[PDB]
Amino acid sequence: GSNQNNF
Ligand SMILES: [Zn+2]
């Protein structure tokens, strides 16, 4: 899967 982190 692809991952995104929006800190
Ligand atoms: Zn993955």
What spacing in Å lies between the alpha carbon of 7 and ligand 1's midpoint? 19
| Gyration radius from the chain CA atoms | 7
5 Cβ contact list (under 8 Å, min separation 6): none
What spacing in Å lies between the alpha carbon of 6 and ligand 1's midpoint? 17
Method of elucidation: electron diffraction
What is the C-alpha to C-alpha distance for residues 6 and 1, in angstroms, rounded to an integer?
17
What is the C-alpha to C-alpha distance for residues 2 and 7, in angstroms, rounded to an integer?
16
What is the C-alpha to C-alpha distance for residues 4 and 1, in angstroms, rounded to an integer?
10
What is the C-alpha to C-alpha distance for residues 7 and 5, in angstroms, rounded to an integer?
6
What spacing in Å lies between the alpha carbon of 5 and ligand 1's midpoint? 13
